[model samples]
Target: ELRVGLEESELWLRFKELTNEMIVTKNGRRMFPVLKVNVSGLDPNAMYSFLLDFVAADNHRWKYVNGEWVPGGKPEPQAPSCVYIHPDSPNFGAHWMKAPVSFSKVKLTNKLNGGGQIMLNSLHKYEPRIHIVRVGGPQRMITSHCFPETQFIAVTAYQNEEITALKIKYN
Candidate 1:
């Protein structure tokens, strides 16, 4: 088994307290509290590829009203699924293990051109996922994981008071 840790998890938990909302514009919006992680238990010489994707966390569409999220209705049909394969994919495990892995450049969009940008449904809550695949030498099967605190509802604009202030305080 490999070890995985979520970096900036403290900030993610803070966002979760007020409810995490991530913008998904037609032109693509970069996520805040960017997903960064730490990993271990890998062969230094092995080749690996890392990919990220968002899976809807729930079935209902959400509406933020009077400081709360309500089940608005059924969510819109899912758009074409796209995984943001790290540009550094197929890199040596040594390179990956050397430093904390960051998915800072990944973007979200409802329009969907798909590449480093992920397609997400507005008003839908999503769980960001990390998948790791190893290529050879006593090959291990692919594995994926998620951080519950990283969950966020897709939005076109910032809504919550705390959410706005926190974002302004940072990037």
Candidate 2:
């Protein structure tokens, strides 16, 4: 009883084409070019919960040497998963559909001890996915969406000089 959709697929691809990199620090790093989305086809009276999480995109690690991503080694054990719930969750679908949905506050980290931040391994690739669930309804249903163009590599240090240079170029 719910439908979820992603916006800005082109924007995502533009970043991904440059080998989108997310800086995961010992503390935490907020995702740049944050995930922005839209929701529709939900039961207006039913409340909904919006959640986001990052999952391993592949089983291999990557290194950006010589200006390209090359297989490096076996991926590190995946870190603990944390779901970032939209602050306006449990709100009526009508409320959700009224405006665009954004997860700008979501953050990523390599540390496992953070209170509720998402844990990810350096040098690993991940796909950020979003789920919309019908909450407080007699029958619950969930709709999930992931943008392939939004897939990225998490790293403690920028491996791709091009990516670092791109950021600097735009910043």
Q: List, residue by residue over 1-171, the lDDT tens digit for candidate 1.
A: 688899888888889988988988887988898999899997788898988888878777888888898886655655435788888888888988999889988889988573567778788888888998897647566889888889989999887878989887878
In order, candidate lDDTs are: 0.84, 0.80
lDDT of 1 at 59: 72
What TM-score, over all chains together, does every model reach? 0.92, 0.87
Candidate 1 regions off by >4 Å? 73-80, 136-140
- What lDDT, from 0 to 1, does candidate 1 have? 0.84
Please give the clash total of every predicted structure, in order.
0, 0
Candidate 2 lDDT, 105-158, residue by residue in tens: 877888876475778878788898888888787888888788777888998878
TM-score, candidate 2, is 0.87
Specify the highest-lDDT model's number: 1
Report lDDT (Cα) of residue 90, candidate 1. 85
Which parts of model 2 have CA positions greater than 4 angstroms off?
73-80, 165-171
**Model 2: ten consecutive residues of lowest lDDT:** 72-81
